[PDB]
Structure formats: C-alpha cells, structure tokens
Design a protein around this ligand. Structure first.
Ligand SMILES: CC[C@H](C)C(=O)O[C@H]1C[C@@H](C)C=C2C=C[C@H](C)[C@H](CC[C@@H]3C[C@H](CC(=O)NC)N(Cc4ccc(O)c(OC)c4)C(=O)O3)[C@H]21
Ligand SMILES: [Mg+2]
Length: 182
C-alpha cells in the first residue's frame, strides 16, 4: 500500500561536519531511489530541540531531495530522542501537513549517541520504528541495548548498528537488493 516515511536525524554536537553530511547524503540517496513511487517522505532534525526540515506536502510539491535539504543547518546541541519521537508522532504525522490517513507510518531514527532526555513514547506505538545507531558510542553491548526501547519489536530486525559513517553506503546497498516491482 502507501508508506509515509519520516527521517528523524541526529544533529548533536558529537557529529563532525563530514559525518552530518553523510547522514544527509544517505537520506537523499534513499529518496532519489524511491522517487515517483508510493512512498512519501518528511525529514526532522533533532538535537536539544526539533525542527521539521520538510513535511509530506513539501515533498509532494517540490519532489527534489537536493532542494528540500538545501538549507539544513547543523544544530550542534544535545540528543533529546524521547522528545523528538513524541514531536514526530503528534506534529508531523498530520493530515494537514500531507500525511495520508491510510498509509503505513514508518520512522527511521538516525543517531550517534544515547538519549539525554527521558520519558515514554506511547504516542508512537502505531508507528513502525527503525533505529540506526552509528559510531564509537555504540561499541559496548550495553550502549546498543539502550536503543531497543525506541525500536519496534523485535529489536534484532529494527535496530541497526553501524560502526562507522562510511557503512551507511553498505546499508544503502542492502536496501537496494530488496527493491522489487510487485
Ligand atoms: C530492507 C532492508 C533495509 C536495510 C532496511 O531495513 O530498510 C529499512 C531501514 C532503512 C535502511 C530504510 C528503509 C527505507 C524504506 C523501507 C521503509 C525500509 C524498511 C522496509 C520494511 C518492509 C516491511 C513490509 C514489506 O515487506 N513490504 C512489502 N516492513 C514490515 C516488516 C518488518 C519486518 C519483517 O520481518 C516483516 O516480515 C514480513 C515485515 C516494514 O516495516 O518496512 C527501511
Ligand atoms: Mg551525538
């Protein structure tokens, strides 16, 4: 059917400029690959605060991933992931901003650290949640486990741990092998 996908991307101060850019490039690559399909996209940057960089109605109107992410500015603050998930669930998946009432709701969280806030994400229960944890902060098994609370079940399928930012390329390769005409 229809899929309404939101990229929720980390803009924290731990990210070097080239690392932030690789996150952007990954999102653009996925959008370009899936252009003119059944998929619709929205992108939200999160750090201490949250900002919708473009919503579903923007994507439908302009279509161009490069133009849609052209004026993103790296926030450079903390990682309030609990707050960001709640933000998306109540402020982005809304019919007024172009969300389709009959689409499947998907959230892709891209982060390089553990959350600096706390709370619950009960508001996002109906949303399918993928988490991609990248880098040094996720070496220990204990740090990886913290991400499980954000992801859909089972974690083994919805949590992806990449050791370097270069590995987003490999993830994109993997995704492309699962594309089919149905
Ligand atoms: C597909 C492998 C790829 C590496 C991956 O995980 O892609 C994820 C994360 C990230 C890399 C980017 C992505 C971009 C677009 C779609 C939403 C990817 C996930 C696709 C899956 C597809 C899939 C539904 C389906 O098979 N459609 C025909 N589901 C539900 C689901 C999830 C896990 C399952 O084991 C499952 O069993 C049938 C069904 C989903 O929730 O989304 C997503
Ligand atoms: Mg960080």
């Amino acid at each position: 059917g229809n899929v309404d996908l939101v990229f929720l991307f980390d803009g924290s101060m731990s990210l070097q400029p080239d690392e932030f850019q690789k996150i952007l490039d990954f999102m653009k690559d996925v959008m370009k690959k899936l252009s003119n399909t059944s998929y619709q996209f929205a992108a939200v940057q999160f750090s201490t605060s949250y900002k919708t960089e473009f919503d579903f109605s923007d994507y439908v109107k302009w279509k161009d991933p490069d133009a849609l992410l052209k004026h993103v500015k790296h926030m450079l603050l903390l990682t309030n992931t609990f707050g960001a998930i709640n933000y998306v669930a109540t402020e982005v998946f809304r019919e007024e901003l172009g969300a389709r009432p009959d689409a499947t709701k998907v959230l892709i969280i891209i982060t390089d650290g553990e959350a600096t806030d706390s709370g619950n994400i009960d508001a996002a229960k109906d949303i399918i949640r993928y988490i991609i944890g990248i880098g040094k902060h996720f070496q220990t098994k204990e740090s990886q486990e913290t991400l499980h609370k954000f992801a859909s079940k089972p974690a083994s399928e919805f949590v992806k741990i990449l050791d370097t930012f270069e590995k987003l390329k490999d993830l994109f390769t993997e995704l492309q092998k699962k594309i089919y005409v149905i």
